[PDB]
Amino acid sequence: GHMNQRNINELKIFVEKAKYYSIKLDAIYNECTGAYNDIMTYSEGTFSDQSKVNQAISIFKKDNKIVNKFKELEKIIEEYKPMFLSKLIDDFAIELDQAVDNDVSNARHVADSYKKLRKSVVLAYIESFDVISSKFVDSKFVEASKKFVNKAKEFVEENDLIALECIVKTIGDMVNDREINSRSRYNNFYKKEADFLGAAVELEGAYKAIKQ
Amino acid sequence: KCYFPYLENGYNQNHGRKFVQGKSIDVACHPGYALPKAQTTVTCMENGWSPTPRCIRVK
Ligand SMILES: [Mg+2]
Numbered sequence: 298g299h300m301n302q303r304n305i306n307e308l309k310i311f312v313e314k315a316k317y318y319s320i321k322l323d324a325i326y327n328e329c330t331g332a333y334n335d336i337m338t339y340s341e342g343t344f345s346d347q348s349k350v351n352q353a354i355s356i357f358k359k360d361n362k363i364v365n366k367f368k369e370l371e372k373i374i375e376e377y378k379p380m381f382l383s384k385l386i387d388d389f390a391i392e393l394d395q396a397v398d399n400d401v402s403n404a405r406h407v408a409d410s411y412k413k414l415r416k417s418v419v420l421a422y423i424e425s426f427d428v429i430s431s432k433f434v435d436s437k438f439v440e441a442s443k444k445f446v447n448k449a450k451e452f453v454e455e456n457d458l459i460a461l462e463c464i465v466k467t468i469g470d471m472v473n474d475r476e477i478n479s480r481s482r483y484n485n486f487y488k489k490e491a492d493f494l495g496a497a498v499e500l501e502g503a504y505k506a507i508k509q
Numbered sequence: 510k511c512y513f514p515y516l517e518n519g520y521n522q523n524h525g526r527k528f529v530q531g532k533s534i535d536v537a538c539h540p541g542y543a544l545p546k547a548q549t550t551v552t553c554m555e556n557g558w559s560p561t562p563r564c565i566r567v568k
Pocket of ligand 1: 392395403406
């Protein structure tokens with residue numbers, strides 16, 4: 298009754314506030330992927346051009362631009378922010394502090410810390426949805442949300458950014474009363490997409506039984 | 510020589526190989542990613558690979 302409406306309200310507010318999550322994480326990814334690649338090349342092989350690696354660390358470090366883009370994503374889920382997200386932003390910042398100009402000895406640590414943080418951003422969106430959907434009274438929706446959360450997390454472990462795009466799109470469609478697109482949009486290349494979308498269809502059915 | 514880079518979200522069969530000036534290489538990214546402007550080949554030139562191989566997110 299009254300509590301179900303307030304639960305739906307809480308969900309819709311979160312979804313609207315976080316609707317740029319995938320666009321913004323993709324934007325960080327696109328600015329940083331060349332830099333990440335250069336560091337991995339240097340760390341995994343015989344490539345030795347330290348000036349490239351210094352320019353790559355510069356992308357992650359300069360003017361705190363990338364750190365602040367991550368802090369902006371943290372602020373969006375402030376009401377639900379997980380402790381693991383704040384911890385991983387700080388670890389990224391510490392590894393950046395250790396990098397002095399023309400010293401590349403910490404380069405792989407910067408790249409690794411960035412990659413863990415990028416995945417945890419996606420996990421923090423899932424965790425926020427988990428917190429909100431857990432407060433619902435309807436047991437069918439609560440159960441279907443938990444399965445959606447667990448299939449989403451398995452998707453993230455396969456590919457963080459694709460999973461985030463699918464999660465943001467699916468929940469956005471659901472709370473805007475658009476029919477969920479249940480077919481794989483990425484060639485079934487990502488093996489976890491199919492089970493995610495199946496759980497999304499079942500969550501959609503449960504959501505509509507409430508909304509009615 | 511140009512070193513072919515590690516490619517986040519790409520097919521990495523050429524990672525760590527080095528190639529002489531003028532060599533062309535096919536680059537393939539995983540679904541949901543692509544080289545900018547739909548390009549699929551890069552060439553080792555005087556300042557490195559042209560264009561730069563990297564697998565950006567694509568809509
Ligand atoms: Mg370190």
